[PDB]
């Protein structure tokens, strides 16, 4: 409340009220009382020696990747604040969102970034900025992590509460050096930096006593974390973290979370993933961001937000633009979901991304599944049969699967018909070779294990010893990791448990014992219940030559998804055999049907859903029909509700 | 000259003087005072006073008139000129008297 | 209390010489912790004392480089490198740790010159004074070096010690010598009882006192 | 830098009151201290009665409590000191100094106490007297006895005879001052030329006396 | 007569919801102002039940015991139990059995019958802030790193190890005579 003169050797005069009112809400009083101007050097030094201080770093040169692209030719610049229904239509029309109004929605909230709590009160002037935060707590709230961030720097704070109540705290600051928060008292940044780059730096903030407590179980690879954080792109980085969690939720990670170096490391990496996206949009200098980039980046965060919610119950407040959700919703009104799979692969993924970003947690617009199912269907007719998918196709189905996965969380059916179709196609694609590839990706941690159509299938006959048979027999692979992949895989298809596996199909209530179900084939106007359960309330009961031992193999057609009063009585029906059937067929014939291949002793082996002429021609022409093995049979499931065995051809 | 720091809020302060690191063998001290005469100056901790102002200018980078944008840089460099190390073994009460 | 001891009490120096002055303390002079509060002052003749060195050996503002404090613990020393005229005076020292501070003796810094004997002169009482009922004898000891000197009044051969008042002068700005008047105050009656009044000056230069006397006649 | 100002000298009678002021003007730091000390003519420094104007706290000694008190004025920082029931032995010069060193001293205030009324000086000539020779150069003198207060100035032939002159410091006897002055004169210039004594006591009169045998 | 059928296709879907096109940013987000989340953990405090404590009698069965050493029959619970809830899980497992604390001489024996993957609670605990002890007593060197109060062992455990959250499910080490 005046003007102050500052001399040192000329002299300067710094004006308040002026400037102070030009920039709100400065308070050069709380800061004055914060800086502690009557602090004797003895008191200051004692405060300096409390904070952990690092050796430093000599360089570690790193290059920032080209994340956001240049403005895409004649794009329609969109204002997140004022996204009116004014055309801007079509997946092909170039579009970009203005960075300023977009950043205003991402960091809409405001709060205190730098607490008054120890040890932060010693090192930092308390800061009040626009921010977003990722937060979580575990072990009965005894271990907490908060990842508060701006568009300029991140700060992840760990906090552990012992039994006695001692609270140990450790904070990691990441961002551009110049953009780092303001330092209080004698502290300089070089002494606290654990990794530095041309423009970026990773700072650690804690006390010597606290750092001693964390270092017994938490030895970060600060160098590697920093490299990844800088050198990677926002989407590529967000996906690196996503896999970690997905592969961690199975194999029993987050039901009993551990205070491990890897576990605690990932928590911070979650923070960076959300920070990198916002940091990229802010570091544009009043420009616009292409929509194809936004879709891919915010899809990764949307998928990453659900996984941290399921695993840790984490919360995200920020990095959510409703204007983007609005824009993604309009574009989905332009294309027909029933034929989405008829589009380019690039445009397929582009739409499926906007689908999840535009319609977060489904249950509202149940038409998203039609798109995802149009993609898997178009993908299924061109895919070579019984093969282990492909890198590109696995990536495309992974995107489309999240709209399906979320509907499976809801106990409601969510427009059944298509959801059953998507699951039946997924069932046809889980063959012996797809499983082996997924397992190999879990043993090596590669991309093959992140997603498989076999996860969302209607196949419940996969046991441990059955997956062990399909496991990589390579001697070079780690015997341990192979044994775990089978457990992890098997842990992803748990029935009563898991909760993302069944019950939406009306035909499931017509079953007596759920643990005896082997597979469900929902065809048009009929769904078959393949099980070892005799008491299944269907329309008929076929029994296929099983063999002594085994349990039994029943095929119970449920006509129109309406149960029967009770299970059929009397000896089950015999599957009629067919020989008067030629290998050459010029039409379809068999469209709408399912073709099953089981082994008398080993059980079911392959499933095919004759969806088009291309699929059937692959069955006949190829060496699929091999009658040399007596213990193998081929069952034909008709939409009429009949079952038949193909015993030979002309 | 140089003082001792022992324990007037910010509002009645007209001038504030900062020493270099050579003036007092490495210590960072300041002088707070109010505007025949005899001005009584309250002494303060330099690094905390210097750090205080630096935070002000940064927080208001959009309000600098060009005269303050220069002040920011001078407050830096000076701040780093003081070695917080090489202070553990030095006598902190060099300038104390104790009644 | 905390006594303090300076030596020498008088230090004759020529211009350009080197001076050394100690201030031995009775008690340690450490506080918080190795901050020894010992200070040196200089009182030029006729002026207010001023600070020279504080905290054992820190040059106060305006003090030339030739001044330097030394020593620690309980025995210390002040040193003047090449004495100048403006450095003559009295050098005190003080401690501020224990209450009271206490000061030191003085250590006068004086000019050194060649030995000179005093020129003694005795004056019998003045006619005007006896008319007033009083008689005071005067004895001037003028221009001698060093300053140390004592007088003995002998009346009829018997030493006199009652009723004598002495005055000494400072170093003459030019002669660099000293001077001293010794006035023996008596009564007109008591004066007219003894005949011989003697003024004896014992000095360094003279192994035999200088005697200047007179007889009432 | 701190500069101090002290009250003028005061001629006081034993039992009266003298109040000295020490005005501080310059630049200092908070909780500064003002110290008081006295020295008798020809003697060293003694006591250290500290007062902090702001704080007001005071540290005297075994003396100068009842034998002195220390006030202060914060409006201008004057730090008063006074003392009444004063004996002879405490006639002296009282110094005021700022700082814990003490850094900056004041010109001082000399207070002389004595139950003596102003008394003009009596002048007597100091002639060598008969039965004396005094060859080459004769030394004459002037006796100034029984005056109060100080000072007095003794000159010879009114400004002449500047070289070879001594004027001794005043001694106290019977509670009145007294001093002598000497002049060394070549025998050829006396009694051939008149030599007179010019004693001045601006508190009253000046006497002129002629040197005669 | 094998009548041709048509290709499988997706079932039509209803057009999407409208979308606003209305609804302010304040209706989408809350209050703008925020207070970062704090957590008040409810720290339970444990003490020896005193039922159950060490067993008084000395019975053992040879057909169902994991292994023997000297004169102690050892058992591993087939059911996963919380550390605190294993004093019961064992007193009711077999007659005169208690929650054992592996002494240095016997600790290696217990780690040899454990796989590389599995863990095992043990009866070494901290009543307060001093002296670890079992139901038999004694002083145990514990690799303390967390808030303490409960310990487990593993294949390569030279000493009992403290745990951060002792509501986790592990088998339990229990002994008879
Ligand atoms: C400003 O400076 C002082 C210097 O110590 C800071 O100090 C300590 O504060 C705590 C209470 O917060 C006291 O218990 C200590 O006694 C203080 N130490 C000493 C040596 O006095 C202080 O934190 C700062 N001011 C405030 C209000 O915190
Ligand atoms: C304040 O103290 C530091 C160290 O005593 C001085 O720092 C030097 O600056 C030069 C470059 O200008 C660098 O080579 C070194 O960092 C230091 N010099 C040497 C020889 O090590 C600093 O100069 C001092 N401030 C001033 C004005 O001199």
Author numbering:
A (entry chain A): 20 to 28, 34 to 674
B (entry chain B): 27 to 33, 40 to 67, 72 to 135
C (entry chain L): 1 to 217
D (entry chain H): 1 to 213
E (entry chain C): 43 to 219
Authors' own words:
Efficient EBV entry into B cells involves five different envelope glycoproteins, gp350/220, gp42, gH, gL and gB. Herpesvirus gHgL is a heterodimeric glycoprotein complex composed of soluble gL and membrane-bound gH with a C-terminal transmembrane domain. gB is the most conserved herpesvirus glycoprotein and it is thought to drive membrane fusion. gB functions as a trimer and belongs to the class III viral fusion protein group. EBV gHgL forms high-affinity complexes with gp42, which activates entry into B cells after engaging host HLA class II receptors, while entry into epithelial cells is thought to be triggered by a direct gHgL interaction with integrin receptors. Gp42 is a modular adaptor that binds gHgL with high affinity, blocking entry into epithelial cells, while promoting EBV entry into B cells.
